[PDB]
């Protein structure tokens, strides 16, 4: 392909027109044409085309670049120290992979709550408030909250709030086997989101353009979006505020924070031009201002310009939300993490899977280890005729396979109780029995029934371990719950 020109890919939500203005200035000084393109799914197309026809420079959040660098698609970035000193050190950290810089950092992006001041002068502090607020607003033909549900970037902050995480970080490194998408925190967060949908406070099909149009036309009081979205809100004249995201179970929503970054194609015959453009035209006060005026960048990596932008209270809120969430890893496994979470939310939200099934598959799809055990609890009921008769009785659980007593439990009076959970790692039939110990109390004849208890461990359609408990009186072939009846002999 023809290559005398500098080709740049950037997402269609960002200020590509401003960036083209910077490219026109560079064309004047150098005679080199700059073409800015914004194809759909550029982050996916880049590794396919990177065969010629790839861009010379690609702009995306830093999370994608480890994967690009692992596959040899990116040139190493080696700016002078004089240039490095112009950007915040934590932005360089985001583009450092195996000790090498693999992009230039541009801007820090975090999601915020965006709210309509005319509809909602006091935005909710908690997610838990949102359903009641949606009832109130529905009575006036409006909704409380619409935001993009199709992309896990937008739902993650809530899923993370109470404990969800992608990869545990420990001792300078990410453990790619320690994935946090299937824990109690993730489950609680996704369950909340799904219930909002089930209770008709949000629709499963809401995507980027639907939520943007609803907010910018005054149809919904709130949305969740990044700084790039402020420009179309300005034009719409909605009277809006940008604030901290709502809390969930008292924890902050924790957005994954992206650093918009610019990488150089390892196959580009124009590396030096690309480096000249980025360092001497774009990452200057004038360069970033031209992009930012088209669509806001967020908190920019260039210290000299960020000092001006930090006065903007929308940027203070951005940084407030950024501190509460965290900077995404840049490791190759992030792609798999994201497709995993995307599948989970769409499936749970649409009712294809339960929240537990969705996140269990997400855990594996993200590269977490297959949980290959199953547990069950054997339950006992004791029945005394008199209410308030709290006479205690005890029960034993014996393994026939191992010929020993596993556990004993006590019930005072009428009641149900369970033995502690049994764990199985392999399919088969497991044999136990349960019986009541003789009573110390001479006023009662204990039930002498013995129960045979069989646990069948089988695979379900998906290869997951399943355990079913079947219990019978030792006399019989008929199934029966484990229930003992103690007769009182005294008044
Ligand atoms: O839906 C699956 C999707 O997952 C991965 O995309 C993630 C991006 O890598 C990640 O940076 C983030 O993207 C957001 C940008 O950072 C932000 O600048 C703005 O453009 O919105 C983006 C969210 O739409 O989050 C997404 C996950 O939602 C993966 O890399 C993609 O190829 C894949 O299609």
Residue numbers in the entry: 8 to 57, 59 to 499
Study text:
The host protein is FctB, the basal subunit in S. pyogenes pili. This single-domain protein has the same CnaB-type fold as is found for many isopeptide-containing domains, but has none of the required Lys, Glu and Asn residues at the usual crosslinking site. Here we describe the first successful introduction of an isopeptide bond into a non-isopeptide containing protein. We show that by introduction of Lys, Glu and Asn residues into the appropriate positions in the protein fold, together with one further mutation to generate steric constraints on the Lys residue, spontaneous isopeptide bond formation can be achieved.
The quadruple mutant N13K/V26F/Q67E/P117N (hereinafter referred to as FctB-iso) was made, and subjected to analysis by mass spectrometry. We turned, therefore, to a fusion protein in which FctB-iso was joined via a flexible 4-residue linker (Ala-Gly-Gly-Ala) to the C-terminus of maltose binding protein (MBP). Crystals of this His6-MBP-FctB-iso construct were obtained that diffracted to 2.0 Å resolution. The asymmetric unit contains two molecules, A and B. For Molecule A, both the MBP and FctB-iso moieties could be modelled, but Molecule B lacked interpretable electron density for FctB-iso. The crystal structure contained well-defined electron density that extended over the side chains of Lys-13 and Asn-117, clear confirmation of the presence of the covalent linkage between these residues. The introduction of the isopeptide bond does not appear to cause any perturbation of the overall polypeptide conformation, as superposition of the FctB-iso structure on to that of the parent FctB gives an rmsd of 0.73 Å over 118 Cα atoms. As in Spy0128, the isopeptide has a cis-configuration, with its C=O and NH groups hydrogen bonded to the side chain carboxyl group of the adjacent (engineered) Glu-67 residue. The isopeptide plane is stacked against the aromatic ring of Phe-24, ~3.4 Å away, in almost identical fashion to the isopeptide in Spy0128-N, which stacks with Phe-52. One difference in FctB-iso is that its catalytic Glu residue, Glu-67, has two discrete conformations, with its carboxyl group rotated ~90° in one conformation relative to the other. In our engineered FctB-iso structure, no bond formation occurred until the Val26Phe mutation was made, filling a cavity into which the Lys side chain might otherwise fold and directing it towards the Asn carboxyamide group.
